[PDB]
Write an enzyme that holds these catalytic residues in place. Structure first.
Site, PDB file in Angstrom:
ATOM      1  N   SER A 117       0.839  -1.218   0.000  1.00 43.24           N
ATOM      2  CA  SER A 117       0.000   0.000   0.000  1.00 43.24           C
ATOM      3  C   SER A 117       0.876   1.272   0.000  1.00 43.24           C
ATOM      4  O   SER A 117       1.743   1.382  -0.878  1.00 43.24           O
ATOM      5  CB  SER A 117      -1.009  -0.100   1.152  1.00 43.24           C
ATOM      6  OG  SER A 117      -2.057   0.817   0.917  1.00 43.24           O
ATOM      7  N   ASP A 224      -9.687  -5.689  -4.591  1.00 42.17           N
ATOM      8  CA  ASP A 224      -9.136  -4.735  -3.638  1.00 42.17           C
ATOM      9  C   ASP A 224      -9.910  -3.413  -3.758  1.00 42.17           C
ATOM     10  O   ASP A 224      -9.850  -2.752  -4.797  1.00 42.17           O
ATOM     11  CB  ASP A 224      -7.662  -4.521  -4.017  1.00 42.17           C
ATOM     12  CG  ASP A 224      -6.870  -3.698  -3.010  1.00 42.17           C
ATOM     13  OD1 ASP A 224      -7.483  -2.870  -2.284  1.00 42.17           O
ATOM     14  OD2 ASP A 224      -5.666  -3.868  -2.953  1.00 42.17           O
ATOM     15  N   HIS A 254      -7.348  -6.577  -0.081  1.00 39.71           N
ATOM     16  CA  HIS A 254      -6.170  -5.723  -0.061  1.00 39.71           C
ATOM     17  C   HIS A 254      -4.894  -6.353   0.537  1.00 39.71           C
ATOM     18  O   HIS A 254      -3.786  -6.204  -0.021  1.00 39.71           O
ATOM     19  CB  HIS A 254      -6.568  -4.441   0.681  1.00 39.71           C
ATOM     20  CG  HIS A 254      -5.486  -3.418   0.787  1.00 39.71           C
ATOM     21  ND1 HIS A 254      -4.840  -2.920  -0.341  1.00 39.71           N
ATOM     22  CD2 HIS A 254      -5.043  -2.755   1.885  1.00 39.71           C
ATOM     23  CE1 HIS A 254      -4.000  -1.993   0.112  1.00 39.71           C
ATOM     24  NE2 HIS A 254      -4.078  -1.862   1.440  1.00 39.71           N
TER      25      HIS A 254
HETATM   26  C1  EJI Z   1      -2.205   1.826   1.884  1.00 44.70           C
HETATM   27  O1  EJI Z   1      -1.399   2.169   2.767  1.00 44.70           O
HETATM   28  N1  EJI Z   1      -3.380   2.579   1.590  1.00 44.70           N
HETATM   29  C2  EJI Z   1      -4.581   2.016   0.858  1.00 44.70           C
HETATM   30  C3  EJI Z   1      -5.374   3.124   0.143  1.00 44.70           C
HETATM   31  C4  EJI Z   1      -5.755   4.225   1.178  1.00 44.70           C
HETATM   32  N2  EJI Z   1      -6.433   5.300   0.502  1.00 44.70           N
HETATM   33  C5  EJI Z   1      -6.227   5.963  -0.696  1.00 44.70           C
HETATM   34  O2  EJI Z   1      -5.389   5.861  -1.574  1.00 44.70           O
HETATM   35  C6  EJI Z   1      -7.505   6.819  -0.458  1.00 44.70           C
HETATM   36  C7  EJI Z   1      -7.297   8.288  -0.354  1.00 44.70           C
HETATM   37  C8  EJI Z   1      -8.443   9.110  -0.244  1.00 44.70           C
HETATM   38  C9  EJI Z   1      -8.315  10.496  -0.166  1.00 44.70           C
HETATM   39  C10 EJI Z   1      -7.021  11.060  -0.192  1.00 44.70           C
HETATM   40  F1  EJI Z   1      -6.923  12.391  -0.100  1.00 44.70           F
HETATM   41  C11 EJI Z   1      -5.855  10.261  -0.310  1.00 44.70           C
HETATM   42  C12 EJI Z   1      -6.009   8.863  -0.395  1.00 44.70           C
HETATM   43  C13 EJI Z   1      -7.646   6.073   0.921  1.00 44.70           C
HETATM   44  C14 EJI Z   1      -8.872   5.216   1.022  1.00 44.70           C
HETATM   45  C15 EJI Z   1      -9.261   4.380  -0.052  1.00 44.70           C
HETATM   46  C16 EJI Z   1     -10.394   3.559   0.066  1.00 44.70           C
HETATM   47  C17 EJI Z   1     -11.121   3.592   1.271  1.00 44.70           C
HETATM   48  C18 EJI Z   1     -12.291   2.707   1.503  1.00 44.70           C
HETATM   49  O3  EJI Z   1     -12.854   2.546   2.587  1.00 44.70           O
HETATM   50  O4  EJI Z   1     -12.681   2.007   0.383  1.00 44.70           O
HETATM   51  C19 EJI Z   1     -13.802   1.119   0.484  1.00 44.70           C
HETATM   52  C20 EJI Z   1     -10.714   4.394   2.345  1.00 44.70           C
HETATM   53  C21 EJI Z   1      -9.579   5.198   2.220  1.00 44.70           C
HETATM   54  C22 EJI Z   1      -4.488   4.804   1.832  1.00 44.70           C
HETATM   55  C23 EJI Z   1      -3.741   3.656   2.564  1.00 44.70           C
END
Ligand code: EJI
Length: 280
Positions: A117, A224, A254
């Site tokens: 991630s 994922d 994931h």
């Molecule tokens: C790994 O360390 N990561 C997995 C993805 C996670 N994430 C993003 O990339 C999304 C994000 C959102 C807004 C931002 F400003 C920056 C990054 C955040 C995220 C993705 C998906 C979900 C979810 O519940 O999907 C069902 C929550 C958060 C960062 C950590």
């Protein structure tokens, strides 16, 4: 007064390093009994910590690799405000500090990066900052894509100034229960400032791909919801690397290294083969 972890343990009793900002980072090592054949740094993801890689690290150590890790700033047993970073490059800078320290003690050995991630985005940015320096990268659902609706939203929220459902992390319910009760994991919602730094990480990863030439193994689950599988296909296409391999886990979520036993066992085996072939 002794410097202590956020859990109040003095750093003097734990392996640690002090980063360029004077912050203590908690360190972990898994050294083989004999002379190591290679070094591998384990780069954890957002909200988690290095202890989550205990079993993978013991598998790598069994292949005569010296495995090492630290909790990134604002994570686990390391100092800093929780899940806050002045700029995403602090994570890369700190990995390079630890890698440079290990290379001083074990000169001549190839060095690999393994990241999940956010930790995979750090590994990509680390290898792109030093082309040709790393022997290879193992990426488990790396963070390489940003949803445009969340991106525009966080930019406007930052101009003015919710926790993830753990069941999306893995189909393995026992692993979800372990995650939910680990006191070193931050399961809180994303802070706006940190969301901005994750968007910076994604943008920097996009710009680094034309210069990314390090060999890599990319493991990605098709289901994922955190790092969409589309990003793993784009990473395979856009990286310049002459040695790149993708393995898709159909239906997996994931956290592939903590997924259903059939997936986890295959992940451990594939990383073992890939790193074994590149340390022979
Ligand atoms: C790994 O360390 N990561 C997995 C993805 C996670 N994430 C993003 O990339 C999304 C994000 C959102 C807004 C931002 F400003 C920056 C990054 C955040 C995220 C993705 C998906 C979900 C979810 O519940 O999907 C069902 C929550 C958060 C960062 C950590």
């Amino acid at each position: 007064s002794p410097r202590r972890t956020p859990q109040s343990i003095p750093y003097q009793d734990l392996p640690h390093l002090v980063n360029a900002d004077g912050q203590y980072l908690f360190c972990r090592y898994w050294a083989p009994t004999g002379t190591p054949k290679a070094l591998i740094f384990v780069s954890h993801g957002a909200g988690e910590h290095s202890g989550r890689y205990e079993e993978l690290a013991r598998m790598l150590m069994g292949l005569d690799l010296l495995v090492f890790a630290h909790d990134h700033v604002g994570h686990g047993q390391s100092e800093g405000e929780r899940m806050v970073v002045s700029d995403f490059h602090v994570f890369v800078r700190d990995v390079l500090q630890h890698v440079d320290s290990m290379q001083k003690d074990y000169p001549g050995l190839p060095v690999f990066l393994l990241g999940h991630s956010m930790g995979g985005a750090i590994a990509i940015l680390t290898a792109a900052e030093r082309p040709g320096h790393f022997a290879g990268m193992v990426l488990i659902s790396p963070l390489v894509l940003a949803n445009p609706e969340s991106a525009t939203t966080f930019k406007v929220l930052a101009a003015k100034v919710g926790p993830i459902d753990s069941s999306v992390l893995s189909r393995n319910k026992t692993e979800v229960d372990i995650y939910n009760s680990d006191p070193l994991i931050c399961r809180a919602g994303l802070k706006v400032c940190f969301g901005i730094q994750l968007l910076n990480a994604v943008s920097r990863v996009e710009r680094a791909l034309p210069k990314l030439t390090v060999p890599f193994l990319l493991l990605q689950g098709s289901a994922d919801r955190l790092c969409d599988s589309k990003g793993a296909y784009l990473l395979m296409e856009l990286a310049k690397s002459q040695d790149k391999t993708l393995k898709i886990y159909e239906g997996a979520y994931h956290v592939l290294h903590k997924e259903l036993p059939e997936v986890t066992n295959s992940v451990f085996h594939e990383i073992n083969m890939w790193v074994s072939q590149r340390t022979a």
